[PDB]
């Protein structure tokens, strides 16, 4: 049995848990033994709750950043149902409350006792708050359609909570052996190494002598490093590049100088370097597993006569704000001495004056640990920048995680994405951030849902491959019952793999109509039916995707092929007819990280009580070059829309009226206001949030509209500028925002007043932007690779300047943008 659960793993995981032991390395060993255990003691605690406490586990609130309602109710056993009429403002208890009134009656005769089911959802309704606050309620409202609930007992709760179980001496100079490699290449070639500390590095660097393209090649040669040995920190990283010269690079790898248990390493290493685009302090510290095909290099880190870094207790037995908000020489020093004043005083600059410690002098980071162990926690978002790359000390990182603890799983969720990357940045396996996302993973299902996907979805990736296979492992240890259902979803991946294949072979040999039957043959083999039904979906573990409806799924007509699949439920109604697009061949990342940054805005906006109607889709990668996107069901392209089709509703005598014909069509008499407000309101959070991003190439094909008036956004691999992106104004959207007329400067301005307040509540936390693409930069995305990136977004949200500035310097992008406009 406890075959079948390891085999299940590494089905799961991708990657075979034979090759975690065939690398006999103590490291993993050690991660392996005690993640586990970590994760086993979790699963335990998980056995026991209180029956609210597994809801809050298995299905969390999903909550909102006077008027009556109507509502079905039912309970689980008979299709008996009533509706019943109530205050948006009514606690879900008040609800229950009536139903039990309504069945007590019928029936001839304890409100606590029950939790409301979402019908065919894993979602559901409790807690002390009014029906509108949840996200369900509050849809409901806004679609127009009547909340559907089941009465959900205690003892049917616990039932599935039970279905669900398992030193300071050496003063001479620190230098390596450079003995040999053996590469391959094409002319001279040179090796440089460098001492570094995160970004900056902790002496100069140096290099080899020339030696010709020779080898399979050959130095010993001593390096020396201009520091000493007693300073070296913590976390000392070395780094090497080699390159051809008579300037062309070939390969790079790093170690860290200490092992994992604080032992300086000594002797001899082989090093199995990676492939180049000349230092790289960023890349990971452990070797190319490609061993065979990798250039490796041979070096000698000597043994000075064990030693360990020294423990905590010896570390701690052993004119001026103007700057304040890039620093001198001098103004550093004030700092570094003020140093107390500063824990005293400014505890929000501690990372201001880490970066002006001298992390290559000892004693100095000394008295910098020693200020640190009493440094009150910080804020999130000072936590969320301590995470960066400019921060490799473990004992800044173990006070990050510290001061992260108090993230909320929301926010924690809204965060997930960057946390995932900045693992990369890790020296090694067992490491606060892993333990901290593990046990909040497994304390939330639907973080341990999104963690796994994070994961899962970089198994193609060599530098990552062992890392994420590692988490993902204790993960499921902690979660036997996840991982079942986890499956059950890769299952479904691999299946739309293959019938994805098919449909590209399929489409290049015959007609569309004749592949989309073929399609439908394939889906309706007893394999498919199965394996694509009764699921979980990846995009949102809370949907529940039943049968596949093979009439309505298709393919879409470009490139890459993408399968549209729909689904439906008898269960969850209309709300059960959802589907997912899957996408194989393009690459996913770039589309969700804009569409987090975007579902952001969204709940930045919300908070100061500004609505502007977005539609956050799902977007989900998988694995390699594969994930979905959300089926966001009554929409369709302006492109399409604009097409001008006869023999329908939207007939128009100009080109310009066909936008607004068609939201005529879908709304008619009083209806047709609101869908403008609506596409109004979506046009406004759009044209900012494409305008800050950096995001172009927008044109009618890859905006859309929703029935409701929506406007939205897809396909965007372009951003931060990368082909300073004007900002935009369609004539069309602003004939709709006009009402159709010529001129009406009361709608067009509200509107402007829109993109105004979207724009400068985002400025507010303009912090949190750069903090998070910091954290990104992690990720190696083409587009996000380096300063100039960054830039771009501190000059779209003008972060230096005056609020009155910026608004005023937007003011004229957007008069500009106008002008534009015909």
Same mark, same amino acid.
């Given at each position: 049995v406890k075959k079948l659960i390891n085999s299940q793993i590494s089905l799961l995981i991708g990657k075979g848990l034979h090759e975690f032991d065939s690398l006999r390395d103590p490291e993993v060993n050690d991660f392996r033994t005690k993640m586990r255990q970590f994760c086993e003691e979790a699963a335990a605690h998980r056995q026991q709750l209180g029956w609210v406490e597994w809801l809050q586990y298995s299905f969390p609130l999903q909550l909102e950043p006077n008027r009556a309602l109507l509502v079905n109710v039912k309970f689980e056993g008979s299709e008996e149902s009533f509706t019943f009429q109530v205050s948006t403002k009514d606690m879900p208890l008040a609800l229950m409350a009536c139903a039990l009134r309504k069945k007590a009656t019928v029936f001839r005769q304890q409100p606590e006792e029950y939790a409301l089911q979402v019908n065919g959802r894993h979602e559901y309704l409790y807690g002390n708050y009014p029906l509108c606050h949840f996200q369900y309620i509050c849809s409901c409202l806004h679609s127009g359609l009547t909340p559907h609930l089941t009465m959900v007992h205690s003892s049917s709760i616990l039932a599935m909570r039970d279905e669900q179980s398992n030193l300071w001496s050496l003063e001479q100079p620190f230098s390596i052996e450079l003995i040999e490699g053996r590469k391959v290449n094409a002319m001279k070639l040179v090796v440089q190494a460098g001492l570094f500390h995160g970004n900056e590095m902790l002496c100069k660097t140096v290099s080899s002598s020339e030696v010709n393209v020779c080898s399979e090649p050959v130095w010993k040669q001593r390096l020396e490093f201009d520091i000493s040995v007693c300073d070296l920190p913590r976390m000392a990283r070395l780094c090497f590049a080699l390159y051809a010269v008579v300037d062309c690079p070939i390969a790079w790898a790093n170690l860290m100088l200490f092992d994992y248990k604080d032992q300086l390493k000594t002797g001899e290493r082989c090093l199995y370097m990676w492939p180049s685009v000349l230092l790289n302090p960023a890349g990971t510290v452990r070797g190319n597993p490609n061993t065979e095909s990798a250039a490796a290099l041979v070096i000698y880190l000597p043994e000075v006569a064990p030693v360990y870094f020294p423990a905590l207790e010896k570390i701690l037995e052993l004119l001026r704000e103007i700057l304040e908000r890039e620093l001198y020489e001098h103004e550093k020093d004030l700092v570094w001495k003020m140093r107390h004043e500063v824990q005293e005083h400014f505890p929000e600059a501690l990372a201001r004056l880490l970066l002006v410690t001298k992390w290559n002098k000892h004693e100095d980071v000394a008295q910098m640990l020693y200020l640190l162990c009493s440094w009150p926690e910080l804020p999130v978002l000072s936590a969320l920048e301590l995470l960066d790359f400019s921060f490799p000390d473990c004992y800044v990182g173990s006070f990050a995680i510290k001061s992260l603890r108090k993230l909320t799983d929301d926010e924690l969720f809204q965060y997930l994405l960057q946390l995932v990357q900045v693992l990369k940045y890790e020296s090694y396996l067992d490491c606060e951030l892993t333990k901290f996302l593990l046990g909040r993973a497994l304390a939330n299902r639907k973080i341990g849902h999104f963690l796994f996907w994070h994961l899962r979805s970089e198994m193609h990736v060599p530098s990552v491959a062992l890392r994420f296979g590692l988490i993902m492992e204790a993960y499921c240890r902690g979660s036997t019952h996840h991982m079942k259902v986890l499956m059950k979803q890769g299952e479904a991946l691999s299946k739309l793999k293959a019938l994805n294949d098919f449909v590209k072979v399929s489409s290049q040999k015959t007609t569309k109509p004749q592949t989309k039957e073929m399609m439908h043959m394939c889906m309706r083999q007893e394999t498919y039916m199965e394996a694509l039904s009764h699921l979980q979906s990846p995009?949102?573990?809370?949907?529940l995707l039943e049968e596949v409806c093979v009439e309505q799924c298709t393919f879409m007509d470009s490139k890459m092929k993408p399968l549209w699949i729909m689904y439906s439920s008898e269960e969850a109604g209309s709300a059960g007819n959802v589907g997912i697009i899957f996408k194989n061949g393009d690459d996913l990342r770039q589309d969700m990280l804009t569409l987090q940054m975007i579902q952001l805005m969204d709940v930045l906006w919300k908070q100061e009580g500004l609505d502007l109607r977005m539609t956050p889709y799902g977007c989900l990668p998988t694995g390699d070059r594969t994930g979905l996107i959300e089926v966001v069901l009554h929409s369709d392209t302006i492109a399409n829309i604009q097409l001008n089709k006869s023999n329908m509703a939207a007939t128009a005598a100009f080109n310009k009226d066909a936008l607004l014909n068609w939201l005529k069509s879908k709304n008619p008499g009083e209806a047709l206001d609101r869908a403008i407000e609506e596409f109004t309101l979506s046009c406004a959070g759009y044209c900012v949030a494409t305008y800050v991003l950096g995001? !172009?190439?927008?044109h009618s094909d890859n905006i859309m509209i929703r029935e409701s008036g929506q406007l939205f956004h897809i396909d965007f691999g372009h951003f931060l500028g990368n082909f300073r992106v004007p900002f935009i104004l369609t004539y069309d959207f602003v004939h709709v925002i006009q009402q159709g007329k010529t001129n009406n400067s009361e709608k067009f301005e509200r509107f402007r007043g829109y993109c105004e307040r979207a724009y400068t509540i985002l400025r507010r936390h303009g912090l949190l932007f750069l903090h998070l693409f910091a954290l990104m930069r992690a990720a190696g995305l083409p587009e996000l690779s380096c300063s100039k990136d960054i830039q771009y977004l501190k000059d779209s949200l003008?972060? !230096?300047?005056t609020e009155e500035e910026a608004l005023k310097h937007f003011r004229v992008k957007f008069n500009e943008a106008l002008r534009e406009s015909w």
């Open positions: 995009l949102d573990p809370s949907t995001i !172009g190439d927008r003008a972060l !230096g300047k």
